[PDB]
Structure 1
Amino acid sequence: MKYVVVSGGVISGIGKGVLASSTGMLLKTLGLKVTSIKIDPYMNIDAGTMSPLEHGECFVLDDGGETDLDLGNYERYLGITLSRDHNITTGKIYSHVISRERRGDYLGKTVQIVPHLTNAIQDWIQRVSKIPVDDTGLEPDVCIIELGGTVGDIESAPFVEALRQFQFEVGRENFALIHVSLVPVIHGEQKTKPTQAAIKDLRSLGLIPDMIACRCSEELNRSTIDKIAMFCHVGPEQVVNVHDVNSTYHVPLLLLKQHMIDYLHSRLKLGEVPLTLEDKERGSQLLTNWENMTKNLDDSDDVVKIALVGKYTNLKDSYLSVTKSLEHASMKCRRQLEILWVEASNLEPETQEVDKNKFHDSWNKLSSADGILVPGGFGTRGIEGMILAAKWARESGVPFLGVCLGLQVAAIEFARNVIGRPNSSSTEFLDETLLAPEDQVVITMRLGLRPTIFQPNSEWSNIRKLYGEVNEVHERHRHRYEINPKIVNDMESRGFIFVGKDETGQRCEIFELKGHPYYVGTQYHPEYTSKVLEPSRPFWGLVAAASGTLGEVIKDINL
């Protein structure tokens, strides 16, 4: 086993999550079975309690574990599947050892937070890094630990102590620390004193740093690096600069130009880890897929405009997984992406009574879009705008994907505007009216990776061509409310055909509309399973249809 801990910061907004998700990617190019752990200093047990307004979207794992965003960034960069244990939190570990006290397992000793709770952290990291994460049950070679918060805090405090002991309870040369740090620029001069005042605290809290990964606004001066290597004890080759480049998928290749694999190969003796040619050649091939997709980003010019239609579009992190899946689908089509933020409530005609500028800008963005996405919203208060965009996408022939709530407004749209029931309703919203035309029903939660089976006649469905025509699809779910299955025999007659269903047959999970270029609902969330080299099939479908050449993508899949 080996560990690399990514850590530090003068400030908590500094962006450690790319250097974690990008260090682990570079180590996966050596062919190593890499894994990752997030530490979050917040008290939440797991993210399911905190709304998407409050620091971004509610992620989903194979377990159903509603979790921190930063798990998702490692899953999509590293190709790995994570579990709800990979998110260490102050909530979890304190709830764990305090529940263990009432169980009695410390034999009625004191449960001081030094010794015993820092021992539970060091045990948890050693459990979790041995859980398998790739397509086979082989245990990881290297674990990337992202230490949330900063080193020099009061929510960080048990973790930085636990990791001082863990620098020895796992031997040095099986552990390395990467310290992210701030180097401000003021009046044209690079200021390395915030960094030198977090190297003092790092040595004090007891870890010793290996890298000094500065988030400067610039290239670091040769004299700036020379002084950081005088005040921190690292050699000047190790003072990596992580400055902005044309997209975040380039960041691994900047770190590779900055020798970071050659340093980590030495500093963790990675030549002593046992690897097969099936490991190593997969490693060097994955490097060439990353060099190819970044070269394709560097000279892709032909734009594709996708309208993302929903509430809270000013909080873009409320959709981080939706955005990132369109970026993967974009780079695979070799069309450059623009996403058009349509704040759905502005499409509703009553907006014309409040501000006409909002009513025109939103319908302008929607009309300009080469493809349309209803992105699995939350709450109900924007729903009429999401219905109008689904009417537009059906009648104007524009490519369409409905995710989760998106499948459900598509059924509501089709009921109101093709089946001809204008009172038909989201039972998710208009409940205590008790009306008969209910497009949905509550069936109290359903979460995690679940099996979707294709219905028998489905051969013609573009969505089934995009899934490689395989009879079952494994994808991640969230929904309380599902389509009322007593309308399905009507929709099945009117050309709205339910391509895919749950294994009991009673629950509807995919539809495709007959006789449209690409119009799909998926009631699972296709966002979360997308990887940077394997875009999620419904999202690859959307960005292909909007680019043209949907047929040529269907060959690239099925060959």
Structure 2
Amino acid sequence: MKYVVVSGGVISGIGKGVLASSTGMLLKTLGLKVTSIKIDPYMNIDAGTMSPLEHGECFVLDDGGETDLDLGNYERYLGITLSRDHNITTGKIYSHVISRERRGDYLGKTVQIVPHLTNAIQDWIQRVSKIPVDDTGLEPDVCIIELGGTVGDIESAPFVEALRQFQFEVGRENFALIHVSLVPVIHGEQKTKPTQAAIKDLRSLGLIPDMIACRCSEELNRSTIDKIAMFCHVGPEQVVNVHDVNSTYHVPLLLLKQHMIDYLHSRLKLGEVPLTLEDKERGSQLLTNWENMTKNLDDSDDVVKIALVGKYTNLKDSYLSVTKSLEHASMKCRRQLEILWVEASNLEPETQEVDKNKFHDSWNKLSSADGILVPGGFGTRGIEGMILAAKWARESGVPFLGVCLGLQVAAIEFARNVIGRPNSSSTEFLDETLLAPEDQVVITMRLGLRPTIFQPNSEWSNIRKLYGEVNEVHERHRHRYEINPKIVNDMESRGFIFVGKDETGQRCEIFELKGHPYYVGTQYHPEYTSKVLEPSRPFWGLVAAASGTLGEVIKDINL
């Protein structure tokens, strides 16, 4: 196994995940089988009970792991499936050796951070990097390890000791370190000093970078590259310049043209990995696919506006998988996506009494939609704001997708305005009395990859026709609440057909409304299964409907 560690910098939120994902994607263009491990040095065992103001969205895995959105970056760039073992945390690793000490496995010795916890980190990396994550089912060739946070944090201390020990457990030809760092620009001076401090903090912890990646608001000057290669003990070929590109799909193509792949190929002896003519063929095909879709994104600049209505829409990484899933769909349609970031609370009439401007800008943005998305949501504050947008899309014919909370507000709105239940509601939203017209109810979490089966007469529906001839869709869940199973056969009478369900028939998982060109929702999160070259079908349907091109996209799928 070869290891690329992507690490550090003076800040988090810089590009370690995009650069790791890009590096792994580029090694996959040589036909290498690439896996990835995220290390999040935090006490949380998982991202499941975090709130998205810190580290953005939760990402759900096939096994129902709730994880850092970096695993989502790896899944979509590398085209791989990860387990909850591919995320290591301080919480996970301390819990592991503390269980192993209580079990007596350390044979009466003092259990210590070195050797025992750093051994356990190295054992975890070696175990998990051998797990097959491609659909070929073969063991990986390269593992990208991304060390989250900053090097020289108190939290990352056990992991940097584990990684400098690992660098000698595996040979030098098997381990390379990339350090990502900020080059700030101050009065048009590009400042090298934060990167010099960061490389001295690496050396202080016993690590030496094989690459520097510099993140900057402009291209590095050759003065700046040479001063980095003086005060950090590296050659100028070992500095890469990653300059705030207009889209993340272009970042691999910077790293490619700057000869990073030629450096890593030599530095890790990658020509000595056995690769078949089929592997190099798949690798070269991926390069041509990626260059095609990046050219298409760059060239095909004609707009589509999708209004995204939800909480926290000022923090755009709170919806990273939604944003990326919408981009995959829009790039497949060769249209320039704009996301209209509508704070759902601003649409509520109670905002208009506080401020005219936010209410009118948010309703004008919602009115400016070619299509509407109500994504999954983190809490109750804004449910009426989302029901208002669910209504306006139904009323005005604008293409609509309801994902998770979106399906729940779509069924609530339709019950209120089309079934004729003028007070029907959500058990999540209110429990002040034991209401009889409860549309959304509980049946501690439903997580991971589950089968949704299509209902027998569903073939009229555009959502099934976007999946094609198939009877099952396999998709990822994250919900404790769902629709009340006694109400659904009354709701189907007005045309809100539950197109797909659990194999039991007791859980409702896809709907399409008959009386509308595209008014759909899913109880699964379709974002988490989206890939750069093959979008998630509900999101491809939404953007194709919003473009007016739905029939042409449904025709391409069923061919």
- Quickly name the TM-score band, shorter chain normalised: over 0.9
Cα shift readout 1:439-486 (whole Å, capped 9, x = no counterpart): 022003211111100000111111111112211011110111110011
Q: Secondary structure at the match of 1:203?
A: helix
Structure 1, 478-487 or 219-228: larger mean CA deviation: 219-228
Partners of 2:14 and 2:481 in 1: how far apart? 39
Q: Does 1:137 align with 2:137?
A: yes
- By how many angstroms is 1:129 displaced? 0.4
Partners of 2:516 and 2:539 in 1: how far apart? 17
- By how many angstroms is 1:228 displaced? 2.0
Structure 1, 191-200 or 328-337: larger mean CA deviation: 191-200
Q: Secondary structure at the match of 1:440?
A: strand
- By how many angstroms is 1:139 displaced? 1.1
Distance 1:151 1:435, change over 3 A: closer
Partners of 2:433 and 2:368 in 1: how far apart? 38
Cα shift readout 1:328-366 (whole Å, capped 9, x = no counterpart): 111111110111111112222333333222322222111
Equivalent pair of 2:28/2:283 in contact (CA under 8 Å): yes
Equivalent pair of 2:478/2:524 in contact (CA under 8 Å): yes
Partners of 1:197 and 1:309 in 2: how far apart? 42
Equivalent pair of 2:308/2:373 in contact (CA under 8 Å): yes
Distance 1:540 1:192, change over 3 A: same
Q: Secondary structure at the match of 2:431?
A: coil
Distance 1:180 1:422, change over 3 A: same
Distance 1:230 1:289, change over 3 A: same
Equivalent pair of 2:496/2:512 in contact (CA under 8 Å): yes
Q: Secondary structure at the match of 1:201?
A: helix
Structure 1, 200-209 or 472-481: larger mean CA deviation: 200-209
Distance 1:13 1:349, change over 3 A: closer
Cα shift readout 1:359-416 (whole Å, capped 9, x = no counterpart): 2222211111000011111211211111111111112110000000110111111111
Partners of 2:382 and 2:448 in 1: how far apart? 26
Cα shift readout 1:171-229 (whole Å, capped 9, x = no counterpart): 11011111112333333332222222222222231122111111122222223222322
Cα shift readout 1:240-291 (whole Å, capped 9, x = no counterpart): 1011122111000000000111111111111111222222111111111110
Structure 1, 223-232 or 237-246: larger mean CA deviation: 223-232
- By how many angstroms is 1:231 displaced? 2.9
Partners of 1:209 and 1:203 in 2: how far apart? 9
Partners of 1:272 and 1:23 in 2: how far apart? 19
Partners of 2:297 and 2:33 in 1: how far apart? 27
Partners of 1:32 and 1:81 in 2: how far apart? 16
- By how many angstroms is 1:144 displaced? 0.3
- By how many angstroms is 1:233 displaced? 3.0
Structure 1, 178-187 or 75-84: larger mean CA deviation: 178-187
Structure 1, 11-20 or 395-404: larger mean CA deviation: 11-20
Q: Secondary structure at the match of 2:202?
A: helix
Q: Secondary structure at the match of 1:308?
A: strand
Structure 1, 258-267 or 121-130: larger mean CA deviation: 258-267
Equivalent pair of 2:4/2:145 in contact (CA under 8 Å): yes
Which residue does 1:245 correspond to in 2?
245
Partners of 1:201 and 1:429 in 2: how far apart? 49
Equivalent pair of 2:216/2:244 in contact (CA under 8 Å): no
Cα shift readout 1:45-101 (whole Å, capped 9, x = no counterpart): 101121123331122111111111111111111111111111111111111111211
- By how many angstroms is 1:127 displaced? 0.6
Which residue does 2:7 correspond to in 1?
7
Partners of 1:483 and 1:31 in 2: how far apart? 45
Structure 1, 192-201 or 413-422: larger mean CA deviation: 192-201
- By how many angstroms is 1:295 displaced? 0.2
Distance 1:236 1:53, change over 3 A: closer
Equivalent pair of 2:371/2:400 in contact (CA under 8 Å): yes
Q: Secondary structure at the match of 2:96?
A: helix
Partners of 1:232 and 1:358 in 2: how far apart? 49
5+ long unaligned stretches in structure 1: none
Q: Secondary structure at the match of 1:219?
A: coil
Once superposed, what is the RMSD of the aligned Cα atoms?
1.3
- By how many angstroms is 1:432 displaced? 4.3
Distance 1:480 1:204, change over 3 A: same
Cα shift readout 1:1-21 (whole Å, capped 9, x = no counterpart): 111001131333432111111
Equivalent pair of 2:196/2:232 in contact (CA under 8 Å): yes
Distance 1:353 1:221, change over 3 A: closer
Distance 1:185 1:318, change over 3 A: closer
Cα shift readout 1:478-523 (whole Å, capped 9, x = no counterpart): 1111100111111222211111000111110000011311110101
Cα shift readout 1:284-332 (whole Å, capped 9, x = no counterpart): 1111111011101111221111111112222222212111111111111
How many equivalent pairs are there? 559
Structure 1, 151-160 or 403-412: larger mean CA deviation: 151-160
Distance 1:362 1:196, change over 3 A: closer
- By how many angstroms is 1:29 displaced? 0.7
Q: Secondary structure at the match of 1:363?
A: helix
Distance 1:506 1:13, change over 3 A: closer
Partners of 1:392 and 1:220 in 2: how far apart? 49
Distance 1:97 1:407, change over 3 A: same
Partners of 2:430 and 2:156 in 1: how far apart? 45
- By how many angstroms is 1:536 displaced? 0.7
Partners of 2:350 and 2:151 in 1: how far apart? 51
When normalised by structure 1's length, the TM-score is 0.98
Identity, in percent, stands at 100
Partners of 1:482 and 1:183 in 2: how far apart? 48
Partners of 1:186 and 1:302 in 2: how far apart? 36
Partners of 1:348 and 1:12 in 2: how far apart? 35
Partners of 2:181 and 2:350 in 1: how far apart? 49
Partners of 2:25 and 2:393 in 1: how far apart? 38
Cα shift readout 1:18-51 (whole Å, capped 9, x = no counterpart): 1111100111111111011111111111011211
Distance 1:359 1:209, change over 3 A: closer
Q: Secondary structure at the match of 1:213?
A: strand
5+ long unaligned stretches in structure 2: none
Structure 1, 403-412 or 489-498: larger mean CA deviation: 489-498
Equivalent pair of 2:24/2:144 in contact (CA under 8 Å): yes
Q: Secondary structure at the match of 1:49?
A: coil
Equivalent pair of 2:416/2:423 in contact (CA under 8 Å): yes
Structure 1, 419-428 or 175-184: larger mean CA deviation: 175-184
Partners of 2:369 and 2:319 in 1: how far apart? 18
- By how many angstroms is 1:122 displaced? 0.5
When normalised by structure 2's length, the TM-score is 0.98
Equivalent pair of 2:453/2:502 in contact (CA under 8 Å): yes
Q: Secondary structure at the match of 2:48?
A: helix
